[PDB]
């Protein structure tokens, strides 16, 4: 029902080794569609999903120009951050930004985002009201006073209620066949002997979109979420995802364990067991 | 689509 668009900024300073590196990636839900790297030869915004290639030449030039301007913008940010914290000009530091929007079934804005981190810690974030800012410390409060006087949030709100949702709707339609159709996971349970009295049962999910998934092992009907080994959901590289869940079980009791699979593409939640 | 944010710290 709901969808989202995100842009991810990474600015990394490297004293002596040139200018700061600026990188940008765009996602619609869990699909990458656009990218930019400042260290590319003739740097510009590139397509990463076939449905974005439909966009005209005016799009790519303006997209590229924003990215090239950002390289300058975030070079200023990094230097300003140094003075704000009394840090030396010889250290490598990171600034991150995530911004985008969430839409409902009607294509309306659910909520908007504009969040900043410095060296992995919260710096400044746009409130859900799209009018005020949350500073994580006193250094970021300086930015907050700057941004309140300069009426920054207005620009944010204008984009999120206007261009953000408008462009997302266009992307969702142009790539409806992949973005709006969910891919069901292919599931199976494998058997791996460890000792004489202990075997690992591994519950697989393969080729699913979107990434959102829940895999829980159950014995006799009770949640085994403490004795479950769980790996992070991982990209297959073909835009679909992978995940598995493991549980060490006694020999001859494999039939007593159940794997519950929850995913958007599944008409009903699946329950699986080891097939001897 | 992106938008340009020229505002800094």
């Amino acid at each position, epitope marked *: 029902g709901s969808h989202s668009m995100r842009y991810f900024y990474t600015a990394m300073s490297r004293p002596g080794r040139g200018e700061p590196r600026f990188i940008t990636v765009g996602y619609v839900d869990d699909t990458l569609f656009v990218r930019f790297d400042s260290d590319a030869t003739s740097p510009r915004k590139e397509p990463r999903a076939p449905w974005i290639e439909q966009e005209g030449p005016e799009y790519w030039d*303006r997209e590229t*120009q*924003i990215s090239k*301007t950002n390289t*300058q*913008t975030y*070079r*200023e940010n990094l*230097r*300003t951050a140094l003075r704000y914290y009394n840090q030396s000009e010889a250290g490598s530091h990171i600034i991150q930004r995530m911004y985008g929007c969430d839409v409902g079934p009607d294509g309306r804005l659910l909520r908007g985002y504009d969040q900043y981190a410095y060296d992995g810690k919260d710096y400044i974030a746009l409130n859900e009201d799209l009018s005020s800012w949350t500073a994580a410390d006193t250094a970021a409060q300086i930015t907050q006073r*700057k941004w309140e006087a*300069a*009426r920054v949030a*207005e*620009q944010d709100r*204008a*984009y999120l209620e*206007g*261009l953000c949702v408008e462009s997302l709707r266009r992307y969702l339609e142009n790539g409806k066949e992949t973005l709006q159709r969910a891919d069901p996971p292919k599931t199976h349970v494998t058997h791996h002997p460890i000792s004489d009295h202990e075997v690992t049962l591994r519950c697989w999910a393969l080729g699913f979109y979107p990434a959102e998934i829940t895999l829980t092992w159950q014995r006799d009907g009770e949640d085994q979420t403490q004795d479950t080994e769980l790996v992070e959901t991982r990209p297959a590289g073909d835009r679909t995802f992978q995940k598995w869940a493991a549980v060490v079980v006694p020999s001859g009791e494999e039939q007593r364990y159940t794997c519950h699979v929850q995913h958007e593409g599944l008409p009903k939640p699946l329950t699986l067991r080891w097939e001897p | 689509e*992106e*938008y*340009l944010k*020229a*505002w*800094t*710290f």
Partner: T-cell receptor
Amino acid sequence: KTTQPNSMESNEEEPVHLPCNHSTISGTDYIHWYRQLPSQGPEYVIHGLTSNVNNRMASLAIAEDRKSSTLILHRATLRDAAVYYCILPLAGGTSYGKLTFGQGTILTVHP
Amino acid sequence: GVSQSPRYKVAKRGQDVALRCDPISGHVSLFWYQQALGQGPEFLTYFQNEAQLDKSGLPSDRFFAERPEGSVSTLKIQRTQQEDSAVYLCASSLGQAYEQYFGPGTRLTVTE
């Protein structure tokens, strides 16, 4: 890129309305106004985006469709006689704050 | 505020001149503009701290600009020509997009 009138006359102690056209404005562009008094460096007056902004000397009024705006001086003095520039510094998402003035409305305030 | 020296400079054609700008302390952004008579100011070059990141407004490679320590800025015009005659304006801001504070300008006149 903005267009504005060639000149404007007004009496002192009376309000001045300085109009500006910007029909190609991006939904995220800022409207800025600067001014230059005779034989002096330019100076910032006001800026805004969608809703009207207030000072005790100058106000900015932006149209609903955002295609035009107005610089309102409330109590214009002889000192206010200047050139007034209407600028879109971001230029539709292509520039960083560097100012393009470039052709403004010459003020005359009459005693 | 921002200051500039000298107020006025009369120069013989072919000689080199130096235009100095002392910006407001703690301002990252520094702008130079050129104002030829009967016109608005025109962007010359930009400084982010000590870094000259945009010089697309400079008329020729005779215009040499520097801001070595991120503060005081110098615009050197080598071998001055009649066309260089104008007011040169220095502006500094708290950051690239914030309000620019202008100096009183340097009036240069190049004579034969």
